Structure formats: C-alpha cells, structure tokens
C-alpha cells in the first residue's frame, strides 16, 4: 500500500513521497502517458508497468510487511499479491536512490500537455 511505499522512499532517498514523487515528470503520480522525462521518471514508468503485471491485485491499498537487513530491503512472506507488490515497490525505491543525482526540481508539478504519450511496457 501507499503507506509502505512512501516509507520505503523516505528511508532510501530522504525525500517525502508527497510532494517529491507524487507529481514528478509524466509517470510519477498521475502516471498515464508520454515519454519519460528523465531517469527518475523512467523509474516511475517501470514502476507503473510493474503494477500492470498484477491485474487482480490492489497495490494502493494492500499492505505488505518488509524489513531492513543492513540497509537491504527484504520483503517478508505474505500473499502472492503482497509479495509481488513489495518487489515492485522495492525496485522503484532503489531506482530512485540510483538517480538522486539527476533529480530536477524543474520536473515537479510537470504540466500534462507536455507528455508525448507512447511508451508501451
């Protein structure tokens, strides 16, 4: 659920999910269409695509448990949806941590019309 994901992001990047990653680029938050603007935005594109492989699950509201084993993120045993949702979130957090260097405030609150809608997952 958004609760776990937002906490995972804070621990990793030090930034708060909202408003740092809630409305960034074309795919972070109201991800929908367009060409990802940068690395961080690609992180969200792939994340959105990751949730897309789980049609009968509910990523926003289903809670899963996870632990830290010396900085490492470990998804604990839960239901299939919970295990797979955690794996998707875990990737995004690492992806975000990997592209902090190129995170640009220039992309916060990015306008809709500027998204050239075409990347198939």
């Amino acid at each position: 659920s958004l609760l776990e994901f937002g906490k995972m992001i804070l621990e990793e990047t030090g930034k708060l999910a909202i408003p740092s990653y809630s409305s960034y680029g074309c795919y972070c938050g109201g991800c929908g269409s367009g060409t990802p603007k940068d690395a961080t935005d690609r992180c969200c594109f792939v994340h959105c695509c990751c949730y897309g492989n789980l049609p009968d699950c509910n990523p926003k509201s289903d809670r899963y448990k996870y632990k830290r084993v010396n900085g490492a993120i470990v998804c604990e045993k839960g239901t299939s949806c919970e295990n797979r949702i955690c794996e998707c979130d875990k990737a995004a957090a690492i992806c975000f941590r990997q592209n902090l260097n190129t995170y640009s405030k220039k992309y916060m609150l990015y306008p809709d019309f500027l998204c050239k809608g075409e990347l198939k997952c």
Binding site: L2, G6, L16, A17, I18
Partner: peptide, 5 residues
C-alpha cells in the same frame, strides 16, 4: 499527504 499517492 505522507500516507498517499
């Protein structure tokens, strides 16, 4: 905010 999208 914190707890969401």
């Amino acid at each position: 905010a914190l707890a969401s999208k």
